[PDB]
Short mmCIF file of C-alpha atoms (C1' of nucleotides) in Angstrom, two decimals:
data_model
loop_
_atom_site.label_atom_id
_atom_site.label_comp_id
_atom_site.label_asym_id
_atom_site.label_seq_id
_atom_site.Cartn_x
_atom_site.Cartn_y
_atom_site.Cartn_z
CA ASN A 3 18.46 23.90 -10.51
CA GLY A 4 17.75 22.25 -7.05
CA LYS A 5 14.38 21.98 -5.13
CA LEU A 6 15.17 23.32 -1.84
CA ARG A 7 15.46 26.98 -2.39
CA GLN A 8 12.12 27.84 -3.83
CA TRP A 9 10.28 25.31 -1.71
CA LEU A 10 11.68 26.73 1.74
CA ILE A 11 10.63 30.32 0.56
CA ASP A 12 6.94 29.16 -0.23
CA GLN A 13 6.96 27.67 3.37
CA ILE A 14 8.09 30.99 5.17
CA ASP A 15 5.59 33.10 2.87
CA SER A 16 2.69 30.58 3.62
CA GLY A 17 2.98 31.50 7.57
CA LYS A 18 1.93 27.90 8.29
CA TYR A 19 4.83 27.18 10.65
CA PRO A 20 4.70 29.07 13.89
CA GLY A 21 8.37 30.32 14.20
CA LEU A 22 9.29 30.37 10.67
CA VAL A 23 9.17 34.26 9.87
CA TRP A 24 10.93 36.87 7.81
CA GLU A 25 13.38 38.90 9.54
CA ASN A 26 13.64 41.85 7.19
CA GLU A 27 11.57 43.51 4.52
CA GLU A 28 13.52 42.46 1.58
CA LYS A 29 12.53 38.77 2.43
CA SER A 30 16.19 37.73 2.34
CA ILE A 31 16.73 36.63 6.09
CA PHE A 32 14.55 34.45 8.11
CA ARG A 33 14.33 32.48 11.38
CA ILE A 34 13.84 28.87 11.66
CA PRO A 35 12.88 27.29 14.98
CA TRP A 36 15.48 24.65 16.25
CA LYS A 37 14.64 23.01 19.68
CA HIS A 38 15.98 19.80 21.04
CA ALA A 39 13.34 17.18 20.96
CA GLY A 40 12.10 15.12 24.04
CA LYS A 41 12.44 11.44 24.38
CA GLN A 42 9.85 10.54 21.70
CA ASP A 43 8.03 14.00 22.23
CA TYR A 44 8.55 16.16 19.15
CA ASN A 45 5.56 18.48 19.80
CA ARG A 46 7.68 20.94 21.71
CA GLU A 47 9.44 21.71 18.48
CA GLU A 48 6.97 24.39 17.24
CA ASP A 49 8.09 23.61 13.59
CA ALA A 50 8.21 19.86 13.68
CA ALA A 51 5.44 20.01 11.02
CA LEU A 52 8.10 21.59 8.78
CA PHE A 53 10.53 18.76 8.78
CA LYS A 54 7.77 16.44 7.93
CA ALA A 55 6.81 18.63 5.04
CA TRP A 56 10.13 18.25 3.61
CA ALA A 57 10.22 14.50 3.76
CA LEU A 58 6.69 14.46 2.21
CA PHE A 59 7.57 16.97 -0.62
CA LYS A 60 10.66 15.06 -1.51
CA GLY A 61 9.01 11.64 -1.21
CA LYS A 62 11.18 10.47 1.69
CA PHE A 63 8.05 9.68 3.77
CA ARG A 64 4.93 8.36 1.93
CA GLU A 65 2.27 8.15 4.72
CA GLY A 66 0.88 4.71 5.23
CA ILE A 67 4.07 3.22 3.74
CA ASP A 68 7.11 4.39 6.10
CA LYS A 69 7.47 4.57 9.57
CA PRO A 70 7.40 8.03 10.95
CA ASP A 71 10.99 9.08 12.01
CA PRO A 72 10.92 12.90 12.97
CA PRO A 73 14.63 12.71 14.29
CA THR A 74 15.75 11.58 10.70
CA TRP A 75 13.52 14.21 9.04
CA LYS A 76 15.30 16.89 11.12
CA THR A 77 18.72 15.55 10.15
CA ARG A 78 17.89 15.55 6.48
CA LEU A 79 17.10 19.22 6.46
CA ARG A 80 20.02 20.24 8.82
CA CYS A 81 22.44 18.46 6.24
CA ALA A 82 20.48 19.96 3.22
CA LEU A 83 20.94 23.66 4.44
CA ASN A 84 24.47 23.03 5.51
CA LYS A 85 25.59 21.81 2.01
CA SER A 86 23.42 24.36 0.17
CA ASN A 87 24.93 27.27 -1.60
CA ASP A 88 21.61 29.07 -1.59
CA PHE A 89 21.63 29.33 2.40
CA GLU A 90 24.26 30.66 4.64
CA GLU A 91 23.74 30.50 8.35
CA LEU A 92 24.21 33.96 10.11
CA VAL A 93 25.75 32.33 13.05
CA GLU A 94 26.21 35.59 14.92
CA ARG A 95 22.47 35.99 14.81
CA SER A 96 21.28 32.40 15.60
CA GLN A 97 19.80 31.87 19.10
CA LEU A 98 19.98 28.32 20.37
CA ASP A 99 20.11 28.71 24.23
CA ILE A 100 16.68 30.48 24.75
CA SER A 101 13.23 29.33 25.61
CA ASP A 102 12.06 29.62 22.21
CA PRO A 103 15.15 29.03 19.93
CA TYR A 104 15.80 29.43 16.27
CA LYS A 105 18.67 29.61 13.58
CA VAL A 106 18.95 32.55 11.25
CA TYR A 107 19.57 31.91 7.65
CA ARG A 108 20.35 34.41 4.91
CA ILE A 109 19.70 33.68 1.09
CA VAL A 110 22.48 33.98 -1.41
CA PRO A 111 21.26 35.66 -4.63
CA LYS B 5 39.91 7.86 16.32
CA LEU B 6 39.06 6.48 19.86
CA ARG B 7 40.34 2.90 19.68
CA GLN B 8 44.01 3.83 18.89
CA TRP B 9 43.92 6.79 21.22
CA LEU B 10 42.96 4.81 24.28
CA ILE B 11 45.35 2.12 23.27
CA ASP B 12 48.10 4.66 23.27
CA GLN B 13 47.10 6.00 26.66
CA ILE B 14 47.38 2.57 28.23
CA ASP B 15 50.50 1.89 26.55
CA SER B 16 51.87 5.23 27.86
CA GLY B 17 51.66 4.44 31.67
CA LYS B 18 50.97 8.12 32.27
CA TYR B 19 47.63 7.22 33.96
CA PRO B 20 48.24 5.27 37.15
CA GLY B 21 45.21 2.93 37.39
CA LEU B 22 44.77 2.46 33.55
CA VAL B 23 46.53 -0.77 33.03
CA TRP B 24 46.36 -3.95 30.79
CA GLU B 25 44.84 -6.95 32.51
CA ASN B 26 46.30 -9.59 30.15
CA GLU B 27 49.22 -10.27 27.78
CA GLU B 28 47.23 -9.92 24.55
CA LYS B 29 46.53 -6.28 25.20
CA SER B 30 42.89 -6.86 24.85
CA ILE B 31 41.35 -6.40 28.19
CA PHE B 32 42.21 -3.28 30.42
CA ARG B 33 41.25 -1.59 33.58
CA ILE B 34 40.04 2.04 33.67
CA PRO B 35 39.73 3.96 36.98
CA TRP B 36 36.23 5.40 37.71
CA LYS B 37 36.07 7.36 40.86
CA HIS B 38 33.12 9.44 41.84
CA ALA B 39 34.17 13.14 42.12
CA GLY B 40 32.33 14.12 45.30
CA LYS B 41 33.84 11.13 47.48
CA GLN B 42 36.61 11.68 49.93
CA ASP B 43 39.41 9.81 48.29
CA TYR B 44 39.17 11.85 45.15
CA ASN B 45 42.13 13.61 43.74
CA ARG B 46 41.08 16.04 41.06
CA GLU B 47 44.43 15.87 39.36
CA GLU B 48 45.17 12.31 38.44
CA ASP B 49 41.27 10.99 38.54
CA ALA B 50 40.22 13.52 35.94
CA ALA B 51 43.38 13.35 33.82
CA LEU B 52 42.28 10.82 31.32
CA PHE B 53 38.98 12.22 30.58
CA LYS B 54 40.72 15.75 30.08
CA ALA B 55 43.13 14.23 27.90
CA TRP B 56 40.31 12.93 25.57
CA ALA B 57 38.49 16.52 25.81
CA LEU B 58 41.85 18.02 24.75
CA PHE B 59 42.83 15.51 22.06
CA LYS B 60 39.37 15.97 20.39
CA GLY B 61 39.34 19.67 20.81
CA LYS B 62 36.45 20.32 22.85
CA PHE B 63 38.59 21.76 25.79
CA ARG B 64 41.37 24.21 25.38
CA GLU B 65 43.69 25.05 28.21
CA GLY B 66 43.60 28.71 29.20
CA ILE B 67 40.59 29.43 26.89
CA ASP B 68 37.62 27.49 28.26
CA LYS B 69 36.42 27.04 31.83
CA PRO B 70 37.33 23.49 33.05
CA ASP B 71 34.13 21.06 33.38
CA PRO B 72 35.52 17.75 34.63
CA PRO B 73 32.00 16.29 35.05
CA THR B 74 31.54 16.66 31.16
CA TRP B 75 34.99 15.47 30.24
CA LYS B 76 33.86 12.12 32.25
CA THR B 77 30.55 11.98 30.42
CA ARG B 78 32.06 12.48 26.89
CA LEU B 79 34.25 9.46 27.54
CA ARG B 80 31.64 7.17 29.14
CA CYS B 81 29.16 7.75 26.30
CA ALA B 82 31.96 7.25 23.69
CA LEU B 83 32.68 3.98 25.28
CA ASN B 84 29.18 2.71 25.46
CA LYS B 85 28.29 3.64 21.89
CA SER B 86 31.63 2.24 20.38
CA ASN B 87 31.53 -1.24 19.22
CA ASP B 88 35.19 -1.40 19.72
CA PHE B 89 34.65 -1.46 23.46
CA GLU B 90 32.32 -3.83 25.32
CA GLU B 91 32.30 -3.62 29.19
CA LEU B 92 32.71 -6.75 31.41
CA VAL B 93 30.13 -5.88 33.95
CA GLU B 94 30.96 -8.80 36.15
CA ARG B 95 34.62 -7.76 36.51
CA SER B 96 33.72 -4.22 37.15
CA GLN B 97 33.87 -2.95 40.90
CA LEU B 98 32.36 0.41 41.05
CA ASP B 99 31.17 0.18 44.72
CA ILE B 100 34.64 -0.42 46.47
CA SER B 101 37.34 2.01 47.76
CA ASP B 102 39.44 1.94 44.61
CA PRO B 103 36.65 1.59 41.87
CA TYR B 104 37.12 0.73 38.26
CA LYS B 105 35.43 -0.36 35.14
CA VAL B 106 36.75 -3.20 32.90
CA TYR B 107 36.61 -3.20 29.05
CA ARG B 108 37.45 -5.55 26.18
CA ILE B 109 38.81 -4.44 22.90
CA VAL B 110 37.12 -6.06 19.93
CA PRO B 111 39.55 -6.45 16.93
"C1'" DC C 1 21.33 20.21 39.27
"C1'" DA C 2 26.49 18.53 42.41
"C1'" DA C 3 27.68 14.51 40.06
"C1'" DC C 4 26.06 10.92 37.69
"C1'" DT C 5 23.74 7.68 34.25
"C1'" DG C 6 21.50 4.92 29.72
"C1'" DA C 7 19.25 5.92 26.12
"C1'" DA C 8 17.80 8.94 22.44
"C1'" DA C 9 18.70 12.92 19.90
"C1'" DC C 10 22.13 15.34 18.07
"C1'" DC C 11 26.12 17.03 14.98
"C1'" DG C 12 29.64 17.81 10.72
"C1'" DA C 13 31.58 15.97 6.97
"C1'" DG C 14 32.90 12.97 3.39
"C1'" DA C 15 31.12 9.49 0.36
"C1'" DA C 16 27.35 8.03 -2.09
"C1'" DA C 17 23.28 8.76 -4.20
"C1'" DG C 18 20.35 10.88 -7.32
"C1'" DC C 19 19.26 14.30 -10.90
"C1'" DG D 1 28.28 18.54 -14.10
"C1'" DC D 2 24.96 20.04 -9.65
"C1'" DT D 3 22.20 18.92 -5.63
"C1'" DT D 4 20.36 16.27 -1.64
"C1'" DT D 5 20.99 11.94 1.15
"C1'" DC D 6 23.48 8.13 3.51
"C1'" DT D 7 27.15 6.56 6.77
"C1'" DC D 8 30.36 7.18 10.17
"C1'" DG D 9 32.21 8.05 14.84
"C1'" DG D 10 31.54 10.00 18.38
"C1'" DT D 11 28.83 14.21 21.10
"C1'" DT D 12 25.23 16.40 23.95
"C1'" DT D 13 20.60 16.48 25.99
"C1'" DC D 14 16.90 14.05 28.18
"C1'" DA D 15 14.63 12.71 32.32
"C1'" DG D 16 15.64 11.46 35.74
"C1'" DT D 17 19.07 8.73 39.67
"C1'" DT D 18 22.73 8.37 43.12
"C1'" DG D 19 24.59 3.33 38.46
#
DNA sequence: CAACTGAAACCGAGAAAGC
DNA sequence: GCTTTCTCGGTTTCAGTTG
């Protein structure tokens, strides 16, 4: 019983993250924005709030104690999805080289 | 992987300007010609950078479109970030006819 | 945006950590 | 076990510069 699976579902269903949307009706495939940050400018990442949310939920960032580190927050979730058996990247559907890019992930039941 | 690979390339002697500058095999000269300039030969001047792109798997002959400028960027940035290589900027001459950088190898 | 650059952001994968 | 994070060694983009 790991924490990432259900947490991530709740974030997509909430609709609080601009580009974090379902791609099918079954709610088993979804898009996650993935844009290369600027030099100390992480607002172009329309889902930067998502990476912060994961460090908050997991306690890896406690506001007022730790120094903000968005680049690291992004690496923690990248490595988390890669090593997860609950998610497989649909590399054929991922779109990294467009004006508003995203990865595509599917949920293994 | 980089430290031993670049040693082997210098030892090999396949690269005309890539030579040792001392007996201890701890300081070496690496050619660094600008691609647009007039005395630039695409074959030998891009050879070492391509060798690195091939060795690591980035470039694949007959499969990928050549991109010499990238190959050069790869190795430049790999030397900067490596703590196995510090540049001796006072010994480097990048603004002459036969330009070169100079690097020391930390053991 | 041709070639080029330093610095920052980025990456996979194995070891380490945590549960 | 069973899942996330840390460490390592380069790699690629960022925001310009001609290094």
